[PDB]
Design a protein around this ligand. Structure first.
Ligand SMILES: Nc1ncnc2c1ncn2[C@@H]1O[C@H](COP(=O)(O)OP(=O)(O)O)[C@@H](O)[C@H]1O
Ligand SMILES: [Mg+2]
Lengths: 325, 327
C-alpha cells in the first residue's frame, strides 16, 4: 500500500479528484491519498507540508489550479521538473476528424523562451532572452530516448528551428544527435517546427515520439490535443529530480460548472494512469484505463463536454462498475 | 506592367515557370524582370541593391523562397516588408477535414526571434534575443485593422504569450489593445498561442483575421495552410508602404521534388492572380483564379498532394487550355 500526494485544486478540481479517488478504490488500487494545498506563501515558495509530502511520496496528482508568481512555475523549480510528457492518443469511440493518432510529446520544461528574463533596452524596445544549454538539452533527449525504449516506440523526432535560430536551436539539435548516436535501437530524425505543424494537421500518423525545447513543446502538445478532443481528455505528467513526478490535468478550473456535478474527469484519470504505470502498478493501470475507454466507446453516459448530458457522478459510476470485472 | 521576379530556392524556379506559362496563355500584359538573391555568396549586399532598385521602379514583385541576418530578413528590411498576409481559404473541390474555411493570417516580419541575435554566454549556454518594439507592433496592428476594415472583416485576433514574456509579448498586446480602440466597428479578441493552435484544429471557424509577431506567424501560417490543403495551394503576399511582393503562404523549398515535375503550382498561381488584382488587371486576375479553381473542382487533373497522379506540367497546361478557352 502506497501514498500519493493529492492536490485537488480549484473549481472542478475537488470533484474530479474525488472521482479519481472513487475509481481507484473501486479498482482496489493500493493507493492512499495525502491531500495538500499549494497556494503560495512568502518569507515565494510552496507550503512546507506540501514540499515535505512530495519529497516523501515522490508521486503527486494535481488538478487544475487558478491563475493569480504561478504555482506551476514554483512547482517546477521546487522539484526540478525538467521533462513534460504528454501522450496524445485517439479515444476509441469519441469521433474527431482524426483517427489512429498515437503521438508522445517530450517537452523540455526548464529553459528556452521561459527563462523569465527580459529587458527594456531603450524606451519601446524589449529583448526577451531565450536560453538553451548543453545539459538541459542532453537531459531531455536522454529522457525521450529512454521513454521510447521503455514504451515500444520506434522513432524519436527532434523538432527545432535551427535554420532560424542557428546557435541555440543548433545546440539543442547537436545534443539530440549525440544521444541518438548512443541509442542505435531507436530510429532518429530531425524536422523543422513549422513543417511539423504543417504536416501534423494533415497526416498525424507519421509521428511517434517528439522531443523539443520548451516553447515549441508547450505549443505543439496543445495543437496535438486538438486532434483527439481537447484538454479534457489529455493526460500530462512532469518528471523531476529525486524520483519526483507530478501528474496533472492541463485544462482550466472550469468555474462555470464547478460543483454542479457536470465535470469531465478523464484527463486527471488518464494522468493518474500514467502515474500508476510510473509506480509499477501495471495491472491496475490497465484495468482502470480499460474501464475508462470502454465507458466512452459505449456512449450511453458521456459528460456535457463530450456530447452527452450525464452527470459527473453517472460517468464516474459506470466506470466503477466496469472496472469490477 | 513591369514586375520583379526572384525564382528562389528549391522548386521556386519551376513554379515561376508555371506562372510564366499561364500568363502567356491569358495574354497578361505583364513583363517579368528576373533577379537572383537566393543562395548567393560578398555578392550579397550587391544583389540586394539591384532588387531595391528595380523595386523602386516596379513596386511589385513575385518571389520564391529565399534561402548578420538571413537573406530573407535582409531583403524584408531592405524593402520594409513588415506585413505578411496569408489567405487561408478552402478550394471548393479539394476536400479536407476543414472545408468552407476563410481566414487571414497577418504576421510581423522584421523582428522577434528572426533577428539572428545570439551569442555564447558560457561554454554550452547559448543566449538568443527576441526583439519586440513599439513601432513595429503598432504598425502591424494598424495594418491588420485597416485590412479588416477594407475587406469587410469582422474580428481581429491578437495571438501572444504575454503570460510568460510579460514585457516583450506584453508590449505587443499593448499596442494591439491601443490600436483596437480606434476601430470600434471591429471586434477585438486576444488568445494565447498555445490555445489558439488547439483552437485552429478543433474549430478554426471561430477566427477571422489573426495578427501576431514573427515566430507565431510562421507556426500559424503552416498550421492553417495544412487545414485547407497544404503548401501546394495556399498563397501569400508581403507589403511595405509602397511595395507588394507575392509569394506562397507556407514557405518551403521542397528540395525533394526539384527535377521530378511533382510540385503543385496552385499556391504560386493563385498568388500571381492576387498580384494581378494589385495591378488593376482585375479581368486577368479573376480569369486565372477562376481557371485554377475550376480545374481543381472538376477533378480530372490533379497533382500528388491533391489525391491525383498528374505532373506539375500536366496540371499547368490544363490551366492554360482552360484560360485560353475564355479569351
Ligand atoms: N509546391 C508544392 N507542391 C506540393 N507540395 C508542396 C509544395 N511545397 C511544399 N509542399 C509540401 O510541403 C512540404 C514542405 O516541406 P519541405 O520542403 O520538406 O521543407 P522543410 O525542410 O522546410 O520541412 C513538402 O514535403 C511537401 O509535402
Ligand atoms: Mg500549453
Amino acid at each position: 500500500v502506497q501514498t500519493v500526494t493529492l492536490i485537488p485544486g480549484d473549481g472542478i478540481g475537488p470533484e474530479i479528484s474525488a472521482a479519481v479517488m472513487k475509481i481507484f478504490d473501486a479498482a482496489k488500487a493500493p493507493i492512499q491519498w495525502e491531500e495538500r494545498n499549494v497556494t503560495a506563501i512568502q518569507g515565494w515558495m510552496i507550503p512546507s507540508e506540501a514540499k515535505e509530502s512530495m519529497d516523501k511520496n515522490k508521486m503527486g496528482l494535481k488538478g487544475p489550479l487558478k491563475t493569480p508568481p504561478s504555482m506551476n512555475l514554483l512547482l517546477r523549480k521546487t522539484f526540478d521538473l525538467y521533462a513534460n510528457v504528454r501522450p496524445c492518443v485517439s479515444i476509441e469511440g469519441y469521433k474527431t476528424p482524426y483517427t489512429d493518432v498515437n503521438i508522445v510529446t517530450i517537452r523540455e520544461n526548464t529553459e528556452g523562451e521561459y527563462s523569465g528574463i527580459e529587458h527594456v533596452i531603450v524606451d519601446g524596445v524589449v529583448a526577451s532572452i531565450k536560453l538553451i544549454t548543453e545539459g538541459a538539452s542532453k537531459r531531455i533527449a536522454e529522457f525521450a530516448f529512454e521513454y521510447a525504449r521503455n514504451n515500444h516506440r520506434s522513432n524519436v523526432t527532434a523538432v527545432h528551428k535551427a535554420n532560424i535560430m542557428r546557435m541555440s536551436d543548433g545546440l539543442f539539435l547537436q545534443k539530440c544527435r549525440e544521444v541518438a548516436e548512443s541509442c542505435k535501437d531507436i530510429k532518429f530524425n530531425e524536422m523543422y517546427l513549422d513543417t511539423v505543424c504543417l504536416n501534423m494537421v494533415q497526416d498525424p500518423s507519421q509521428f511517434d515520439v517528439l522531443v523539443m525545447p520548451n516553447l515549441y513543446g508547450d505549443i505543439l502538445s496543445d495543437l496535438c490535443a486538438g486532434l483527439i478532443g481537447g484538454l479534457g481528455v489529455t493526460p500530462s505528467g512532469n518528471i523531476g529530480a529525486n524520483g519526483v513526478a507530478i501528474f496533472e490535468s492541463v485544462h482550466g478550473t472550469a468555474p462555470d460548472i464547478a460543483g454542479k456535478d457536470m465535470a469531465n474527469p478523464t484527463a486527471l484519470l488518464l494522468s493518474a494512469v500514467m502515474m500508476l504505470r510510473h509506480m509499477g502498478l501495471f495491472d491496475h493501470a490497465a484495468r482502470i484505463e480499460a474501464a475508462c475507454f470502454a465507458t466512452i466507446k459505449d456512449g450511453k453516459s458521456l459528460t456535457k463536454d463530450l456530447g452527452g448530458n450525464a452527470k459527473c457522478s453517472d460517468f464516474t459510476e459506470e466506470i466503477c462498475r466496469r472496472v469490477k470485472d | 506592367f513591369p514586375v520583379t521576379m526572384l525564382p528562389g530556392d528549391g522548386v521556386g524556379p519551376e513554379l515561376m515557370h508555371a506562372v510564366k506559362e499561364v500568363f502567356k496563355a491569358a495574354a497578361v500584359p505583364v513583363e517579368f524582370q528576373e533577379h537572383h538573391l537566393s543562395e548567393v555568396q560578398m555578392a550579397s549586399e550587391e544583389k540586394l541593391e539591384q532588387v531595391l532598385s528595380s523595386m523602386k521602379e516596379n513596386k511589385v514583385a513575385i518571389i520564391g523562397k529565399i534561402h548578420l541576418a538571413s537573406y530573407d530578413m535582409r531583403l524584408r528590411r531592405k524593402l520594409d516588408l513588415f506585413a505578411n498576409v496569408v489567405h487561408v481559404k478552402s478550394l471548393p473541390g479539394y476536400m479536407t477535414r476543414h472545408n468552407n474555411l476563410d481566414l487571414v493570417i497577418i504576421r510581423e516580419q522584421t523582428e522577434g526571434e528572426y533577428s539572428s541575435l545570439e551569442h555564447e554566454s558560457a561554454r554550452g549556454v547559448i543566449e538568443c534575443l527576441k526583439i519586440v518594439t513599439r513601432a513595429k507592433s503598432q504598425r502591424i496592428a494598424k495594418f491588420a485593422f485597416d485590412y479588416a476594415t477594407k475587406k469587410g472583416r469582422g474580428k481581429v485576433t491578437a495571438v501572444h504569450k504575454a503570460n510568460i514574456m510579460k514585457l516583450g509579448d506584453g508590449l505587443f498586446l499593448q499596442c494591439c489593445e491601443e490600436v483596437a480602440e480606434l476601430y470600434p466597428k471591429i471586434k477585438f479578441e486576444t488568445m494565447i498561442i498555445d490555445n489558439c493552435c488547439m483552437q485552429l484544429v478543433q474549430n478554426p471557424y471561430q477566427f477571422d483575421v489573426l495578427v501576431m509577431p514573427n515566430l507565431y506567424g510562421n507556426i500559424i501560417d503552416n498550421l492553417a495552410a495544412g487545414l485547407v490543403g497544404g503548401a501546394g495551394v495556399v498563397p501569400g503576399e508581403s507589403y511595405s508602404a509602397e511595395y507588394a511582393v507575392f509569394e506562397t503562404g507556407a514557405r518551403h523549398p521542397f528540395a525533394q521534388a526539384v527535377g521530378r515535375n511533382i510540385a503543385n503550382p496552385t499556391a504560386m498561381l493563385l498568388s500571381a492572380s492576387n498580384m494581378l488584382r494589385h495591378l488593376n488587371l482585375e479581368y486577368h486576375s479573376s480569369m486565372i483564379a477562376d481557371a485554377v479553381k475550376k480545374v481543381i473542382k472538376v477533378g480530372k487533373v490533379r497533382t500528388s498532394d491533391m489525391g491525383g497522379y498528374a505532373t506539375c506540367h500536366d496540371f499547368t497546361e490544363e490551366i492554360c487550355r482552360r484560360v485560353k478557352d475564355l479569351d
